Design an enzyme around this catalytic site. Structure first.
Site, PDB file in Angstrom:
ATOM      1  N   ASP A   1       0.837  -1.193   0.000  1.00  0.00           N
ATOM      2  CA  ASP A   1       0.000   0.000   0.000  1.00  0.00           C
ATOM      3  C   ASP A   1       0.874   1.247   0.000  1.00  0.00           C
ATOM      4  OD1 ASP A   1      -2.139  -1.803   0.278  1.00  0.00           O
ATOM      5  OD2 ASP A   1      -2.207  -1.542   2.460  1.00  0.00           O
TER       6      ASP A   1
HETATM    7  N1  LIG Z   1     -10.870  -7.200   2.019  1.00  0.00           N
HETATM    8  C1  LIG Z   1     -10.103  -6.000   2.220  1.00  0.00           C
HETATM    9  N2  LIG Z   1     -10.514  -4.801   1.652  1.00  0.00           N
HETATM   10  C2  LIG Z   1      -9.785  -3.653   1.842  1.00  0.00           C
HETATM   11  N3  LIG Z   1      -8.644  -3.690   2.600  1.00  0.00           N
HETATM   12  C3  LIG Z   1      -8.236  -4.916   3.182  1.00  0.00           C
HETATM   13  C4  LIG Z   1      -8.946  -6.037   2.993  1.00  0.00           C
HETATM   14  N4  LIG Z   1      -8.296  -7.097   3.692  1.00  0.00           N
HETATM   15  C5  LIG Z   1      -7.099  -6.544   4.348  1.00  0.00           C
HETATM   16  N5  LIG Z   1      -7.045  -5.259   4.054  1.00  0.00           N
HETATM   17  C6  LIG Z   1      -6.045  -4.293   4.508  1.00  0.00           C
HETATM   18  O1  LIG Z   1      -4.840  -4.519   3.841  1.00  0.00           O
HETATM   19  C7  LIG Z   1      -3.807  -3.847   4.579  1.00  0.00           C
HETATM   20  C8  LIG Z   1      -2.464  -4.441   4.230  1.00  0.00           C
HETATM   21  O2  LIG Z   1      -2.147  -4.234   2.854  1.00  0.00           O
HETATM   22  C9  LIG Z   1      -4.228  -3.935   6.050  1.00  0.00           C
HETATM   23  O3  LIG Z   1      -4.147  -2.640   6.649  1.00  0.00           O
HETATM   24  C10 LIG Z   1      -5.707  -4.380   5.998  1.00  0.00           C
HETATM   25  O4  LIG Z   1      -6.587  -3.589   6.765  1.00  0.00           O
END
Ligand SMILES: Nc1ncnc2c1ncn2[C@@H]1O[C@H](CO)[C@@H](O)[C@H]1O
Ligand SMILES: [Cl-]
Length: 345
Positions: free
Chosen positions: A300
């Protein structure tokens, strides 16, 4: 100097619940390394279970939100970024909203009808494995109706750059599709993240449709591998996937450049574009074992670091270094934690 609301994101705003997990947990819930699954009924006990653990770390999460708010943090000009998502009417949702305001990120949250609670992610950390179990909760209620409100759609109209993670396919495909079409018809910049292997496997149609409106596509090795397999790219899977995604026609059939970037952990990342016959490696700064604090969210951050520089006119290579820098900052911190901007170096 970027206009206000230059960058728009929509996604799933979630609370991360980070716990030092025991080894049995991964077998008990059939969880895999560096993976994420959407909670099914067999997973539901995990939330009560980890709540019995001490040392819990609660921190705002959500893939799209992580990226967009860091773009905002990097650029450091108030209100350049906009975010839309659905939270519940609970303290978790309010905490997430306050976190955004603290960062000067303009938001227009949809609030879910009670008693649907703000979504949450169980982030299970151990020396052996890291794994996520996501309960989307309120984030599912994100609707085209909320997005199409005059005061929200105006954030989309004023944006020149969009970032939406693949994760939103599960919650509001209609909205992300609408925004994607708006971007292409107006020749804006739409950035898309493959996000997780299960999306390419079970939501192949939606992923490929999104790619057809995307000017830039981000992915990692496991996502490229899963994407490749689903498309019959048997040999040279990761390189073949990069080439395949780059060359997919745009939805209007117009000849246009799409950039594809596939990260590969400590190994060199790959990039190419539709005008490029070759696939380039980009060497990445080697991390010692004791340097790594928490790699959760690095992808991210990588996207944020790249986009923030790329949309301000920095060339490809410079932007890649900015992306690695962003990710490295997050890797050395617990959860997606953005500290004081002065200490970013
Ligand atoms: N289904 C999802 N949709 C959006 N974000 C997600 C989902 N599953 C995990 N994350 C997020 O991805 C992040 C890690 O890349 C974590 O902060 C977590 O909250
Ligand atoms: Cl998201």
């Amino acid at each position: 100097d970027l206009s206000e609301g230059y960058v728009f994101g929509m996604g799933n705003p979630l609370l991360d619940i980070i716990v030092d997990a025991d080894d049995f947990m991964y077998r008990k819930y059939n969880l895999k390394k560096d993976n994420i699954v959407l909670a099914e009924e067999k997973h539901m006990t995990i939330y009560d279970e980890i709540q019995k653990k001490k040392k819990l770390n609660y921190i705002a999460g959500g893939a799209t939100l992580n990226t967009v708010k860091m773009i905002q943090w990097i650029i450091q000009k108030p209100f350049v970024c906009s975010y839309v998502g659905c939270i519940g009417a609970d303290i978790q949702g309010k905490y997430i909203k306050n976190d955004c305001s603290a960062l000067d990120l303009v938001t227009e949250f949809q609030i879910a009808e009670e008693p649907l609670m703000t979504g949450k992610v169980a982030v299970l950390v151990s020396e052996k494995l890291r794994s996520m179990v996501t309960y989307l909760g309120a984030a599912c209620d994100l609707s085209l109706a909320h997005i199409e409100q005059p005061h929200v759609w105006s954030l989309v109209e004023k944006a020149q750059v969009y970032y939406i993670a693949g994760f939103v396919i599960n919650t509001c495909y209609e909205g992300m599709l609408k925004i994607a079409k708006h971007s292409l018809e107006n020749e804006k910049l739409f950035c898309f993240n493959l996000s997780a292997p299960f999306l390419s496997q079970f939501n192949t149609k939606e992923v490929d449709e999104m790619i057809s409106y995307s000017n830039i596509v981000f992915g990692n090795e496991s996502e490229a591998e899963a994407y490749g397999e689903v498309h019959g790219l048997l040999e040279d899977t990761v390189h073949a996937t990069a080439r395949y995604i780059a060359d997919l026609p745009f939805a209007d059939g117009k000849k246009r450049k799409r950039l594809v970037i596939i990260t590969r952990g400590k190994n060199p990342l790959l990039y190419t574009d539709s005008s490029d016959s070759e696939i380039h490696q980009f060497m990445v700064e080697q991390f010692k074992d004791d340097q790594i604090i928490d790699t959760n969210g690095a992808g991210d951050a990588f996207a944020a670091g790249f986009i923030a520089d790329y949309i301000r006119g920095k060339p490809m290579i410079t932007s890649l270094h900015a992306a690695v820098k962003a990710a490295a900052y997050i890797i050395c911190r617990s959860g997606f934690s953005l500290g004081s901007r002065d200490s970013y170096s």
